[PDB]
Scaffold this motif. Sequence first.
Motif, PDB file in Angstrom:
ATOM      1  N   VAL A 587       1.875  -0.633  -6.592  1.00  0.00           N
ATOM      2  CA  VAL A 587       1.900  -1.124  -5.021  1.00  0.00           C
ATOM      3  C   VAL A 587       1.430   0.307  -4.300  1.00  0.00           C
ATOM      4  O   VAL A 587       2.582   1.146  -4.160  1.00  0.00           O
ATOM      5  N   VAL A 588       0.489   0.438  -3.631  1.00  0.00           N
ATOM      6  CA  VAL A 588       0.221   1.556  -2.961  1.00  0.00           C
ATOM      7  C   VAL A 588       0.702   1.574  -1.356  1.00  0.00           C
ATOM      8  O   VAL A 588       0.340   0.518  -0.546  1.00  0.00           O
ATOM      9  N   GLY A 589       1.711   2.357  -0.802  1.00  0.00           N
ATOM     10  CA  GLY A 589       2.259   2.358   0.273  1.00  0.00           C
ATOM     11  C   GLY A 589       1.777   3.493   1.154  1.00  0.00           C
ATOM     12  O   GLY A 589       1.683   4.728   0.565  1.00  0.00           O
ATOM     13  N   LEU A 590       1.382   3.653   2.279  1.00  0.00           N
ATOM     14  CA  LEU A 590       0.867   4.584   3.277  1.00  0.00           C
ATOM     15  C   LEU A 590       2.101   4.913   4.145  1.00  0.00           C
ATOM     16  O   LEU A 590       2.796   3.947   4.710  1.00  0.00           O
ATOM     17  N   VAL A 591       2.530   6.088   4.313  1.00  0.00           N
ATOM     18  CA  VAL A 591       3.672   6.680   5.153  1.00  0.00           C
ATOM     19  C   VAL A 591       3.088   6.592   6.654  1.00  0.00           C
ATOM     20  O   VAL A 591       2.126   7.266   6.733  1.00  0.00           O
ATOM     21  N   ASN A 592       4.019   6.343   7.433  1.00  0.00           N
ATOM     22  CA  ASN A 592       3.660   6.424   8.829  1.00  0.00           C
ATOM     23  C   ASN A 592       4.514   7.558   9.331  1.00  0.00           C
ATOM     24  O   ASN A 592       5.690   7.659   9.249  1.00  0.00           O
ATOM     25  N   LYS A 593       3.903   8.731   9.784  1.00  0.00           N
ATOM     26  CA  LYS A 593       4.353   9.796  10.179  1.00  0.00           C
ATOM     27  C   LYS A 593       5.323   9.727  11.401  1.00  0.00           C
ATOM     28  O   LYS A 593       6.195  10.487  11.431  1.00  0.00           O
ATOM     29  N   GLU A 594       5.202   8.593  12.092  1.00  0.00           N
ATOM     30  CA  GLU A 594       6.106   8.522  13.233  1.00  0.00           C
ATOM     31  C   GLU A 594       7.674   8.339  12.985  1.00  0.00           C
ATOM     32  O   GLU A 594       8.422   9.039  13.461  1.00  0.00           O
ATOM     33  N   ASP A 595       7.743   7.735  11.749  1.00  0.00           N
ATOM     34  CA  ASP A 595       9.202   7.335  11.492  1.00  0.00           C
ATOM     35  C   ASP A 595       9.377   7.332  10.006  1.00  0.00           C
ATOM     36  O   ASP A 595      10.664   6.837   9.569  1.00  0.00           O
ATOM     37  N   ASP A 596       8.544   7.645   9.326  1.00  0.00           N
ATOM     38  CA  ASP A 596       8.550   7.650   7.800  1.00  0.00           C
ATOM     39  C   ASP A 596       8.606   6.233   7.162  1.00  0.00           C
ATOM     40  O   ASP A 596       9.046   6.067   6.179  1.00  0.00           O
ATOM     41  N   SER A 597       8.272   5.344   8.047  1.00  0.00           N
ATOM     42  CA  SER A 597       8.173   3.906   7.398  1.00  0.00           C
ATOM     43  C   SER A 597       6.783   3.865   6.295  1.00  0.00           C
ATOM     44  O   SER A 597       6.153   4.542   6.501  1.00  0.00           O
ATOM     45  N   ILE A 598       6.943   2.951   5.540  1.00  0.00           N
ATOM     46  CA  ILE A 598       5.986   2.876   4.610  1.00  0.00           C
ATOM     47  C   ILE A 598       5.302   1.335   4.550  1.00  0.00           C
ATOM     48  O   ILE A 598       5.966   0.214   4.731  1.00  0.00           O
ATOM     49  N   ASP A 599       4.141   1.169   4.867  1.00  0.00           N
ATOM     50  CA  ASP A 599       3.148  -0.082   4.843  1.00  0.00           C
ATOM     51  C   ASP A 599       2.603  -0.139   3.366  1.00  0.00           C
ATOM     52  O   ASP A 599       1.690   0.546   2.979  1.00  0.00           O
ATOM     53  N   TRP A 600       3.060  -1.007   2.826  1.00  0.00           N
ATOM     54  CA  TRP A 600       2.682  -1.515   1.661  1.00  0.00           C
ATOM     55  C   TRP A 600       1.175  -2.083   1.671  1.00  0.00           C
ATOM     56  O   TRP A 600       1.011  -3.353   1.789  1.00  0.00           O
ATOM     57  N   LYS A 601       0.267  -1.552   1.321  1.00  0.00           N
ATOM     58  CA  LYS A 601      -1.023  -1.860   1.763  1.00  0.00           C
ATOM     59  C   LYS A 601      -1.900  -2.579   0.727  1.00  0.00           C
ATOM     60  O   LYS A 601      -2.479  -3.458   0.828  1.00  0.00           O
ATOM     61  N   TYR A 602      -1.908  -1.874  -0.593  1.00  0.00           N
ATOM     62  CA  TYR A 602      -2.628  -2.351  -1.656  1.00  0.00           C
ATOM     63  C   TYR A 602      -1.706  -2.615  -2.927  1.00  0.00           C
ATOM     64  O   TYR A 602      -0.648  -2.080  -3.318  1.00  0.00           O
ATOM     65  N   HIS A 603      -2.060  -3.926  -3.355  1.00  0.00           N
ATOM     66  CA  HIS A 603      -1.336  -4.512  -4.727  1.00  0.00           C
ATOM     67  C   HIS A 603      -2.339  -4.502  -5.806  1.00  0.00           C
ATOM     68  O   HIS A 603      -3.185  -5.227  -5.629  1.00  0.00           O
ATOM     69  N   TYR A 604      -2.034  -3.470  -6.739  1.00  0.00           N
ATOM     70  CA  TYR A 604      -2.996  -3.718  -7.942  1.00  0.00           C
ATOM     71  C   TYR A 604      -2.320  -4.482  -8.977  1.00  0.00           C
ATOM     72  O   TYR A 604      -1.294  -4.189  -9.556  1.00  0.00           O
ATOM     73  N   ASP A 605      -3.032  -5.511  -9.757  1.00  0.00           N
ATOM     74  CA  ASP A 605      -2.555  -6.287 -10.641  1.00  0.00           C
ATOM     75  C   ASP A 605      -2.717  -5.720 -11.843  1.00  0.00           C
ATOM     76  O   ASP A 605      -3.869  -5.591 -12.525  1.00  0.00           O
ATOM     77  N   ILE A 606      -1.668  -5.317 -12.595  1.00  0.00           N
ATOM     78  CA  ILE A 606      -1.720  -4.735 -14.012  1.00  0.00           C
ATOM     79  C   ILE A 606      -2.529  -5.488 -15.206  1.00  0.00           C
ATOM     80  O   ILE A 606      -3.410  -5.064 -15.818  1.00  0.00           O
ATOM     81  N   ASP A 607      -2.075  -6.731 -15.086  1.00  0.00           N
ATOM     82  CA  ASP A 607      -2.673  -7.872 -16.022  1.00  0.00           C
ATOM     83  C   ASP A 607      -2.093  -9.249 -15.488  1.00  0.00           C
ATOM     84  O   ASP A 607      -1.529  -9.101 -13.935  1.00  0.00           O
ATOM     85  N   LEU A 608      -2.132 -10.348 -15.807  1.00  0.00           N
ATOM     86  CA  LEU A 608      -2.046 -11.592 -15.522  1.00  0.00           C
ATOM     87  C   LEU A 608      -0.791 -11.544 -14.874  1.00  0.00           C
ATOM     88  O   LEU A 608       0.169 -11.312 -15.240  1.00  0.00           O
ATOM     89  N   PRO A 609      -0.359 -12.661 -13.641  1.00  0.00           N
ATOM     90  CA  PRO A 609       0.955 -12.716 -13.186  1.00  0.00           C
ATOM     91  C   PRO A 609       1.744 -13.260 -13.984  1.00  0.00           C
ATOM     92  O   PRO A 609       3.035 -13.237 -14.102  1.00  0.00           O
ATOM     93  N   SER A 610       1.302 -14.028 -15.027  1.00  0.00           N
ATOM     94  CA  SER A 610       2.138 -14.720 -16.178  1.00  0.00           C
ATOM     95  C   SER A 610       2.462 -13.909 -17.414  1.00  0.00           C
ATOM     96  O   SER A 610       3.097 -14.303 -18.268  1.00  0.00           O
ATOM     97  N   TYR A 611       1.862 -12.764 -17.441  1.00  0.00           N
ATOM     98  CA  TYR A 611       1.825 -11.610 -18.789  1.00  0.00           C
ATOM     99  C   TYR A 611       2.885 -10.674 -18.613  1.00  0.00           C
ATOM    100  O   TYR A 611       3.189 -10.324 -17.276  1.00  0.00           O
ATOM    101  N   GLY A 612       3.535 -10.309 -19.640  1.00  0.00           N
ATOM    102  CA  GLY A 612       4.634  -9.583 -19.447  1.00  0.00           C
ATOM    103  C   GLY A 612       4.764  -8.025 -18.866  1.00  0.00           C
ATOM    104  O   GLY A 612       3.762  -7.496 -19.114  1.00  0.00           O
ATOM    105  N   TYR A 613       5.858  -7.771 -18.077  1.00  0.00           N
ATOM    106  CA  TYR A 613       5.776  -6.309 -17.540  1.00  0.00           C
ATOM    107  C   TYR A 613       7.225  -6.228 -17.121  1.00  0.00           C
ATOM    108  O   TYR A 613       7.973  -6.739 -16.246  1.00  0.00           O
TER     109      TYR A 613
END
Length: 658
Positions: A587-613
């Motif tokens: 999950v890629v998060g971008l830092v907001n320099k105003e307050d150091d909050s993080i906007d989780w912007k991109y979610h990359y699926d490693i493999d299927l939702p049902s496959y183990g991780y």
Amino acid sequence: ISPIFQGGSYQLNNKSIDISSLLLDKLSGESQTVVMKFKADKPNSLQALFGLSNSKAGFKNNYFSIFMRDSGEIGVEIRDAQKGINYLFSRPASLWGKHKGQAVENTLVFVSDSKDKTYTMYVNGIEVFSETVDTFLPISNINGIDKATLGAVNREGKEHYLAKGSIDEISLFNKAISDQEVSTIPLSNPFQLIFQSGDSTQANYFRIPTLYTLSSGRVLSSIDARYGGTHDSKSKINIATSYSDDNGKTWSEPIFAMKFNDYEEQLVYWPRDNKLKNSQISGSASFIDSSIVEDKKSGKTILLADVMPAGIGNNNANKADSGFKEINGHYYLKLKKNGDNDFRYTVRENGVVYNETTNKPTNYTINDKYEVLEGGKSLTVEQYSVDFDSGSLRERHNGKQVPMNVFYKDSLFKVTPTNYIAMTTSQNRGESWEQFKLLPPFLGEKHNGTYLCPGQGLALKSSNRLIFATYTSGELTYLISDDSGQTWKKSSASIPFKNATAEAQMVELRDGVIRTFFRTTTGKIAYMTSRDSGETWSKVSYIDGIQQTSYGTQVSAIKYSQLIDGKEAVILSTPNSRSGRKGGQLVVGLVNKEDDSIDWKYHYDIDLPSYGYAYSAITELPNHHIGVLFEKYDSWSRNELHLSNVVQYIDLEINDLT
């Protein structure tokens, strides 16, 4: 040899394909090999890829099938009602589904060997089962077989276990091909193995991966080399390491960072049946959970791990005892001698074993390897080996003598049965490791050791500060060194949890600013922040947008060196699932320099939702690619214990994630 049948590019869209005319009269003799390259990125819950069946009324249970589940499990059935045979062999977590958004070509090899009476299954170059039976059933000697089918099994004229996927290539052989021949079949794997069954560790199982990029560009990995199945301590477990000098393309043969020798390093096939799967090595010392950091100043690599004396794990560890005795702000390792009921000894400077009852030094000393010496002479103990020959686990002496260590069951002097943290260092970037040293207690003499957070420690960019996160009841306990790990101090950070497995990993958002992400019991990943290089810590917040189970899973995290969408970026690796350890994401998060909050912007699926991780390690490789080493299975599930070669490594680019 050459196949008796070969076909390819079959689309399985919930409609079986009949290949009886092509295949049935080709089948001859009692031994067969099936080679199949297939994709299934949207599988049904349970589907057959290949079937050989008696399709007639009354013979619904006369068939052979290769099947898979949407859990990633693979298996076969071999059934014949007249013979009274119903075989089912399978293994969970054996498949890939997608990689970088594209369907993965799995290479399956199934060998049915009449001579050895053995059925063996390989997927993607990994043997997932090998089963020998008393009464062998050749897959084409099933009574009345009259159908060969792709994408279903024909039973009584109907399509059972309908599949969604594709078979780009299927070949059959009237021979049981050898293990050698199997190894020559080309693969299309999206992953590689760093540690694997049969390597230099001789552990059949691995858990708890780490990755760390060293300043030379070498990438270092550590892991639990687990011998007694995949069970946590108590067990036999060593800490092993491997490195890559070519951005993760190839990896060194593993060596040990931390090892005990009270039990043999044995490659064992741990039973997976319900009666025996909870068999656990109960008399061995072990290490468990490691973490790595690099020190700019000295150049050394530092590795910490938890240490467990013989028969001890976190569950039965003495929570009320650090295992040290305090004497003037100094802490000494306590020891109990054979025959005593209390710990009447301590280990002092230069390893002198000292008698507390009568305040005097003995003729015994402890060397650098925590081994017992009498008058300068090495004492020994007899090593144990384990076996299941009797039908249950036995642990017994094997005739070999090894140095007597205070962490051993058979030792003259024993440490307190509790958990410790140890440190080792390397001055050649993982080519060799020093003998480990115990860290002192940080929360008093009557508090058991805190639990190391596996993964990476943190090397602050603008100073010499080194931090390793640990946890215990009610807090994260950061261990801080400013002198290349020679001395440590703690920084306690309260968390609103009693008895959480609060595994925590850190990222430096900017100079002196640390955000720690950690596992909780709430189903959400938590975080806290320091703005003074770890001295003080904020209250706890939670990430929305990612789900974990109630029990949670370790999370790995890095600060990416490059801007993304013009912003500073952090990348988290975790399962994303409220149900089990599956649905792996970066999950890629971008830092907001105003307050150091993080906007989780991109979610990359490693493999299927049902496959183990499960547990995972992430690192920015020197070429700015991302390396991920992860448990590709559900390491919580009591159905997925003791699987070989499921800790796997992949290479990704940021453009893959976004």
